[PDB]
Design an enzyme around this catalytic site. Structure first.
Site, mmCIF file in Angstrom:
data_model
loop_
_atom_site.group_PDB
_atom_site.id
_atom_site.type_symbol
_atom_site.label_atom_id
_atom_site.label_comp_id
_atom_site.label_asym_id
_atom_site.label_seq_id
_atom_site.Cartn_x
_atom_site.Cartn_y
_atom_site.Cartn_z
ATOM 1 N N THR A 1 -2.335 6.281 -10.102
ATOM 2 C CA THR A 1 -2.912 7.318 -9.250
ATOM 3 C C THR A 1 -1.741 8.089 -8.558
ATOM 4 O O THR A 1 -0.886 7.470 -7.906
ATOM 5 C CB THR A 1 -3.760 6.687 -8.135
ATOM 6 O OG1 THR A 1 -4.976 6.234 -8.682
ATOM 7 C CG2 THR A 1 -4.109 7.744 -7.040
ATOM 8 N N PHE B 1 0.816 -1.258 0.000
ATOM 9 C CA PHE B 1 0.000 0.000 0.000
ATOM 10 C C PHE B 1 0.841 1.297 0.000
ATOM 11 O O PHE B 1 0.309 2.370 0.274
ATOM 12 C CB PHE B 1 -0.977 0.055 1.191
ATOM 13 C CG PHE B 1 -1.925 -1.091 1.275
ATOM 14 C CD1 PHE B 1 -2.558 -1.581 0.155
ATOM 15 C CD2 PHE B 1 -2.258 -1.644 2.504
ATOM 16 C CE1 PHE B 1 -3.515 -2.652 0.260
ATOM 17 C CE2 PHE B 1 -3.184 -2.695 2.618
ATOM 18 C CZ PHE B 1 -3.830 -3.190 1.500
ATOM 19 N N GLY C 1 2.144 4.552 -9.457
ATOM 20 C CA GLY C 1 1.695 5.370 -8.336
ATOM 21 C C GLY C 1 1.072 4.446 -7.313
ATOM 22 O O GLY C 1 1.638 3.349 -6.991
ATOM 23 N N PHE C 2 -0.062 4.876 -6.767
ATOM 24 C CA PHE C 2 -0.640 4.200 -5.608
ATOM 25 C C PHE C 2 -1.487 3.041 -6.168
ATOM 26 O O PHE C 2 -2.426 3.316 -6.936
ATOM 27 C CB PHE C 2 -1.552 5.204 -4.879
ATOM 28 C CG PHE C 2 -2.250 4.632 -3.651
ATOM 29 C CD1 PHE C 2 -1.541 3.802 -2.774
ATOM 30 C CD2 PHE C 2 -3.573 5.016 -3.325
ATOM 31 C CE1 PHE C 2 -2.160 3.261 -1.649
ATOM 32 C CE2 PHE C 2 -4.229 4.475 -2.182
ATOM 33 C CZ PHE C 2 -3.494 3.604 -1.322
ATOM 34 N N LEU C 3 -1.177 1.791 -5.781
ATOM 35 C CA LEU C 3 -2.029 0.601 -6.209
ATOM 36 C C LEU C 3 -2.452 0.567 -7.685
ATOM 37 O O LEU C 3 -3.680 0.467 -7.996
ATOM 38 C CB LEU C 3 -3.264 0.461 -5.314
ATOM 39 C CG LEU C 3 -2.963 0.132 -3.839
ATOM 40 C CD1 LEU C 3 -4.201 0.315 -2.960
ATOM 41 C CD2 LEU C 3 -2.441 -1.327 -3.715
#
Ligand code: HEC
Ligand code: HEC
Ligand code: HEC
Ligand code: HEC
Ligand SMILES: [Ca+2]
Ligand SMILES: [Ca+2]
Ligand code: NA
Ligand code: NA
Ligand code: NA
Ligand code: NA
Lengths: 376, 124, 355, 376, 131, 354
Positions: free
Chosen positions: D87, D45, D68-70
């Protein structure tokens, strides 16, 4: 002897048994105090990074601040704020670069200022505390620029605005002594005093040369702004001290952290933040170990403590871990902070006896820099 | 394995931290993320600045000037990290200083660090 | 025979008889007392050379012949970089193909044709003997054979040790016979860590046997016209020197404005600098590079004139990847690079550094 | 027995000794082929993540891509491109959110498209491959949105533009079967076919319920787009197989990956990517181990292989490491890929004998997802 | 330490992955980054969304509903990571699914995951998962 | 004694001699057969109740008295949130201060003053006996003491087990006597995971001993005016109901438009819903919350009217942090919430459930 997780289980079970309600909410950190310590994790050059805010007395993480690529942390000595200079990119590690300074409230940790620095001017380097520096009134942040040439950026923290770049000679690091003046270390072995205004060529005066071309002065000297004392080790553990408290440089006698026999047997300083200085006690701490001469960035397992006036050795502590970085709290009966980049753990020691008191682990990926406020 | 012991170069494996040309590398070996000893991985940008060290080659008894170059514009690879500092000097002698992110000149203003290559440019 | 060819070349090289009015030899413009460059002052100072007619000026600066024998014959390498050849625009394949060109050029030695050159060779009993011994009886009677043999001889003489002695302080330091000063050593370190070595070293990597501080490639570094030289040459205010593109057979418009990377050996004594002699001082040639890297106002001003450097004569195909290095040369590093480049001076020209 | 780093030292020493020059440059990855494998690291995460591009034959990292994120990765089956939905935030993990799709050239790894997705519409979740899916023509990318309700975003890769969001029922995952059609799995136990035009409410049809309410279908079914075969294990290892190749769902006889006696003895599937499917062999591979029923996300040490047509067990391999995810190459003599999140290592096995051939370590912080192209 | 063995709750240390209220946590325990068992660390944003599990408390023998909440708007803490899945169902039963980043309703539209808190809201049992 | 006082309140509660024309008692508007709410149809349906005069209608919906005894006295908590009290705007501190108000309200029981109330009390020999036994001889001859005593008995009666029996299915399930159905259990889980429990649960965390599905706070959820009820109340089209700001002594502008969170016990049998009775169906009250979350065009539409819900009566202080939860209730979740809320019906009202 009860751990903090065990104490909390006990408290939560007693509230459950007593039917106590409480509202889930955002906590405030405890008020900044002498035993707060900050640990920054440059994360071995990762594009994003973290700072841990720690209560040194409890050995507890009380907060965190996210940062971008190799940010420079600063902590107001009076406890009123913390800030960093940081860098982000539009797509993780590429696309458009934005350099910025953020100022934070030290108890809510919310940003209270976000100040853009034009034309991507920060120097991106493994983290050197004195590459970004507050003036002693806390109103101005100064940061170093390397490319295209050495220069110093001036950021007005009170007005929340970038002010200007100053052109400087071939010099490095920034030690502020007044609202409008700081010192740098020059390639030629002098310091340069830089006195600046809002506009106009700054008045740059070099001191005398104070070291030879083949004595290497480390990237992490200690600087006590409230004492005006610059403590600058070389690769061999010879320590240069410069008294800046008059507003001009006065050169103090040099001291040797290691004896002649120790140096002959391979003792040298080594690590990252190799040196700390306690203002009130006028004492110097140096990370040292037996090592080859070009292993100067490896961890060390010992700390020597010496009187800054006479150079007399007060103690040699066996740390019992691989320590890269040290600092001290600036209060009476100070703590000696010993950070292990490899264990990702801060070890908190009694600075008088050298005994390990407690530790805080899981401090990111490659934590390297310890900062405290001098509040006294 | 003793980190404080004198570093001992070899000329038999480029992915190891004791490989002779990596005597002042700080970061990650590019060969481990899809580059090669002297080429960057796909998608990165080759810096035009360099840093220098004189690295002893145990294969021929000669010291060579290694002008390291960063491959830039990616988050750090995380593979084959190494930090050696043979001959490495403080930031005020920057031509020999290896904490600096030497990504200057990389295409597209790339300034993030991914890995480093180790090409020879001369004899000491 | 190797000796004999080159000794015959030695005589031709200093012989004014190869010029129309017999006033000029190769050694007039390539003077051995000046690292084989031109000490004479013309209408444009030393930027361009005056021909045998005493009036015609060229439009390029006369380069050194020292170390020219190390350059490969002209070719396109596998990455599509042209390399090698002779003249600032590579239009001659090699030394032998270059040698005959000054002789027939009306703005240089100005001989009408090959036959006139052969008629001059024939007049001289020493050429009859020396040419016939190396090339066969009758060689001087056949204008084409005679011209080809004279070029051969000239190319052979420029391949001797006399032109490429490898006895500069740099060479001695590399052989372990002496040491650089801290300042020279600093300049060497700057040269290798900044963009200079991306064009002014023989190899991309590894170790050169006989370094001459050029990769033999063609680059447009964005130099302005030298106005007094261009006025002297008479080519006209509308003329554009397209460098490599002007070589017959190159049609690629990406080669416009690209000139062969000069060897930096003897650079300290062969001013003025660049293909049109536009900069008098070696320092100024180095400061020119800061126009791509520095944001300071001083960086846009030519210190010899106090005026802007000027608009590039060819404002396309600049080697921006290499030139935009991100780092400017502060004054201490310009000092260091001058000190290092002075170490590339052959031993016999060290006396020339004073002046 | 000679390693890649050893072979590379010998080649470099020979180039040196011979005076062979070569120009430092940016390498191209080798052409995509059956044995290229992609490993995504969601990094537990973290706000920024990495994908590793690997040659499975040599066991060599041939490239990387930052996310980026997930992020959700996808790989065109014919090898023409790879892409992801990702993201970023304007200040690391805080500030303005930007969701976007990038398409990359599979040999230069350079972005050939960067497509912004309006109003931050991505579902942020531990990585499920079939929460972002390409249509078989490779011209459309479909991504799932969970907030404020289940919905599916349509991204035109050819025109490089987001098109629109499609409203769907209470359904999850996206299995495309045509340029304009995909299936989802609904809370009520049916599948939903969603047929979509350039404008309109999509036409949505349900199958009959194919599993009861107490039978739990895992988050990581295997889907072969070229076979139109959806292979969907339950928590007990019962395997549902749905044939989508006629453009409508036909439910195949259920098979049991584990025997009754093994189930009574605690055998259950467990991990992240628990199931793989080899199209040409019509074969199913399932990660299983002896485990408590609510340890369904822990690593497993065994793989069972079974004939998809009869459900006969063909093999049971002891993998020899804690394995979280498996997948296979889609060529003959396939490789079986066995990724350990805990070891950050991809173990590469012969799928026939189950023997370990080679491994690739140091793959990020918590790598979890393996993706291969079906190029046959 | 057997990761596949039935999980065994304790009531003596909230920083450990076997603490009884953490029976369906996925991420990091807030108490290890400056929060507490039921509060967010400074600087983060408390989500309003939640996930539930029935977690057995070995101390008093009762099963409680823990409605987990995420603290959002920071990078993942990296301290005290844990993944338990007691009664955890696939994403199509999202009330019990724990791979979802449950940051909905957080102030400033914060959506990045930092850590998770473990408050009790009620007693009870589920059909799919009762002690 | 406490028994006696409540038994006196039981008498008063059904006594129409407490109204001016003797046409109505507490029980008329709070009918025990309908969980103590008003079954009667007036000019605005069941939205608002008609007073003793047979024409006057109020402007707010008559609430249940079930469980009202669990609400704390009005106060402002340490976080600056008002909590507790009685009436939808909290204007009475507690049940004792509330009980005398319908008696004297001209739009309700319409007694002219306390003296008129006392006079009616004195006229009844059973009251002379009952009040005197509890309060002392001559109580009914003193209008203030009589009225205050009548309010005390009524408050005591409302605090008996008969108003708050805790015998709903939900209660039986929490005592482990039976199980929810699958739908009801889904409904409960929805209620706890979505925004509802942010306001409709006694506590923030822990286990409530006697849950009544409200935190007793005040919120503006942005309800529209109920047009026909506002017309029936006669307060004028220019009237604005400011909710809590209307309590004397509350001056803080941030309380404008906020109303007390109602207990959801017996919600299934006490429609219509909200402070103004604007929604007749429980499913519509649930769907109202989707207006802050859903992006479907149907979310903007009141299903009972087929037209937009209508602008908030008070367009400030909306509880957006709680309402804008980022998650829409799909139809299956709305069905599950209805099934759950139906389990909060007391045992004696289960037959109304159909
Ligand atoms: C002045 C009138 C000259 C005389 C007489 C000769 N040379 Fe020359 N030389 C001259 C110029 C102006 C130039 C550059 C012209 C251009 O178009 O680029 C040259 C160049 C050469 C070269 C090429 C060297 C290099 O590119 O690095 C060589 C080998 C050369 N010159 C040799 C040469 C010989 C052998 C001569 C007598 C036959 C001769 N030059 C005469 C100026 C003049
Ligand atoms: C390729 C992109 C180059 C880089 C980087 C540098 N140099 Fe260069 N140099 C180059 C060319 C193509 C030329 C000739 C340009 C022309 O059209 O005339 C030059 C010339 C010099 C000179 C003059 C030499 C002479 O006239 O005989 C000097 C002194 C020189 N260059 C030095 C120099 C230094 C010190 C550099 C790093 C700062 C440098 N060059 C970079 C090609 C390129
Ligand atoms: C209809 C004409 C009514 C009669 C007769 C009584 N009540 Fe009532 N009640 C009515 C309304 C419209 C309201 C809400 C008005 C508002 O401004 O909010 C009420 C409210 C109460 C409450 C408060 C309950 C709560 O807030 O949850 C109580 C405790 C109450 N009513 C009791 C009560 C008693 C004791 C009565 C006889 C004296 C009585 N009510 C009569 C409608 C009417
Ligand atoms: C606080 C911001 C709340 C949230 C979130 C939810 N509800 Fe609510 N509810 C609230 C108030 C302040 C009121 C009365 C509003 C008014 O001015 O009248 C309500 C009302 C209800 C009702 C009607 C009950 C009745 O009239 O007696 C129901 C059925 C209801 N609420 C249910 C409900 C559900 C199911 C929720 C989650 C979707 C929910 N509410 C959220 C306060 C708040
Ligand atoms: Ca010249
Ligand atoms: Ca009602
Ligand atoms: Na001129
Ligand atoms: Na041409
Ligand atoms: Na109405
Ligand atoms: Na008021």
């Amino acid at each position: 002897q009860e751990t903090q997780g065990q104490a909390a289980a006990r408290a939560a079970a007693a509230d459950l048994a007593a039917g106590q309600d409480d509202e889930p909410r955002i906590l405030e950190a405890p008020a900044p105090d002498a035993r707060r310590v900050y640990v920054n994790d440059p994360a071995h050059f990762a594009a994003v990074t973290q700072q841990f805010v720690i209560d040194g007395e409890a050995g507890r993480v009380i907060g965190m601040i996210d940062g971008g690529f190799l940010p420079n942390p600063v902590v107001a000595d009076d406890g009123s704020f913390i800030a960093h200079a940081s860098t982000v990119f539009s797509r993780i590690a590429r696309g458009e670069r934005t350099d910025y300074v953020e100022v934070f409230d030290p108890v809510t940790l919310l940003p209270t200022a976000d100040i853009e620095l034009p034309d991507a001017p920060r120097f991106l380097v493994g983290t050197y505390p004195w590459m970004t520096s507050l003036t002693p009134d806390g109103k101005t942040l100064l940061f170093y620029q390397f490319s295209p040439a050495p220069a110093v950026g001036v950021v007005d923290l009170e007005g929340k605005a970038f002010k200007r770049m100053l052109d400087v000679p071939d010099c490095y690091h920034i030690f502020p002594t007044a609202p409008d003046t700081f010192f740098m270390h020059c390639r030629d072995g002098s310091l340069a005093k830089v006195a600046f205004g809002t506009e106009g060529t700054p008045e740059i005066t070099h001191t005398e040369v104070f070291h030879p071309e083949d004595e290497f002065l480390i990237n992490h000297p200690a600087y006590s702004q409230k004492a005006g004392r610059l403590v600058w080790p070389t690769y061999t553990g010879k320590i240069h001290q410069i008294d800046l408290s008059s507003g001009d440089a006065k050169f103090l006698p040099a001291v040797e952290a290691l004896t002649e026999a120790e140096r002959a047997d391979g003792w040298r300083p080594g690590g990252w933040q190799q040196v700390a200085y306690h203002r009130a006690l006028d004492r110097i701490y140096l990370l040292v170990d037996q090592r080859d001469e070009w292993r100067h960035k490896t961890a060390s397992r010992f700390v020597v403590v010496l009187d800054a006036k006479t150079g007399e050795r007060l103690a040699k502590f066996e740390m019992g871990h691989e320590i890269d970085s040290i600092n001290v709290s600036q209060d009476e009966k100070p703590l000696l902070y010993a950070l292990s980049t490899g264990d990702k753990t801060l070890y908190i020691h009694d600075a008088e006896s050298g005994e390990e008191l407690r530790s805080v682990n899981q401090l990111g990926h490659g934590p390297q820099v310890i900062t405290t406020a001098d509040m006294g | 394995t003793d980190p404080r012991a004198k570093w001992v170069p070899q000329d038999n494996d480029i992915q190891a931290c004791d490989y002779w040309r990596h005597c002042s590398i700080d970061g990650n070996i590019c060969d481990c993320s899809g580059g090669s000893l002297t080429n960057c991985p796909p998608g990165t940008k080759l810096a035009t600045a360099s840093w220098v060290a004189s690295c002893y080659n145990p294969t021929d008894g000669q010291s060579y000037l290694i002008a390291y170059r960063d491959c830039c514009g990616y988050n750090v690879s995380g593979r084959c990290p190494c930090l050696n500092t043979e001959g490495e000097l403080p930031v005020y002698r920057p031509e020999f200083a290896n904490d600096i992110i030497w990504c200057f000149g990389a295409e597209d203003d790339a300034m993030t660090y991914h890995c480093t290559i180790s090409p020879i440019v001369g004899k000491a | 025979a190797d000796d004999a060819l080159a000794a015959l070349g030695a005589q031709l090289f200093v012989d004014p008889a190869l010029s129309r009015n017999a006033t000029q030899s190769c050694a007039t413009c390539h003077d051995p007392a000046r690292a084989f460059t031109d000490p004479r002052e013309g209408k444009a100072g030393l930027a361009v050379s005056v021909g045998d007619d005493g009036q015609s000026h060229g439009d390029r600066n006369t380069p050194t012949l020292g170390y020219a024998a190390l350059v490969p014959a002209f070719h396109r390498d596998a990455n599509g970089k042209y390399k090698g050849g002779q003249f600032w625009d590579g239009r001659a394949d090699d030394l032998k193909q270059q040698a005959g060109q000054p002789m027939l050029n009306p703005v240089e030695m100005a001989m009408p044709d090959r036959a006139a050159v052969a008629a001059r060779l024939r007049d001289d009993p020493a050429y009859r003997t020396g040419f016939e011994a190396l090339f066969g009886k009758g060689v001087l009677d056949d204008p084409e054979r005679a011209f080809d043999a004279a070029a051969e001889a000239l190319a052979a003489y420029q391949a001797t040790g006399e032109f490429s002695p490898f006895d500069s302080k740099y060479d001695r330091v590399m052989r372990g016979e002496e040491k650089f000063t801290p300042l020279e050593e600093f300049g060497y370190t700057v040269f290798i860590t900044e963009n200079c070595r991306l064009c002014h070293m023989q190899r991309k990597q590894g170790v050169a046997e006989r370094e001459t501080f050029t990769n033999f490639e063609y680059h447009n570094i964005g130099l302005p016209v030298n106005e007094t030289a261009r006025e002297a040459s008479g080519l006209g205010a509308d003329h554009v020197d397209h460098g490599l593109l002007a070589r017959p057979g190159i049609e690629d418009p990406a080669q416009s404005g690209r000139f062969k990377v000069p060897s930096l050996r003897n650079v300290a004594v062969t001013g003025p600098y660049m293909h049109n002699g536009v900069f008098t001082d070696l320092r100024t040639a180095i400061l020119f590079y800061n126009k791509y890297t520095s944001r300071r106002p001083e960086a846009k001003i030519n210190p010899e004139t106090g005026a802007p450097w000027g608009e590039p004569e060819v404002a396309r195909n600049l080697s921006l990847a290499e030139l935009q290095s991100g780092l400017m040369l502060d004054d201490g590093r310009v000092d260091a690079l001058v000190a290092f480049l002075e170490t590339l001076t052959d031993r016999r020209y060290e006396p020339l550094l004073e002046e």
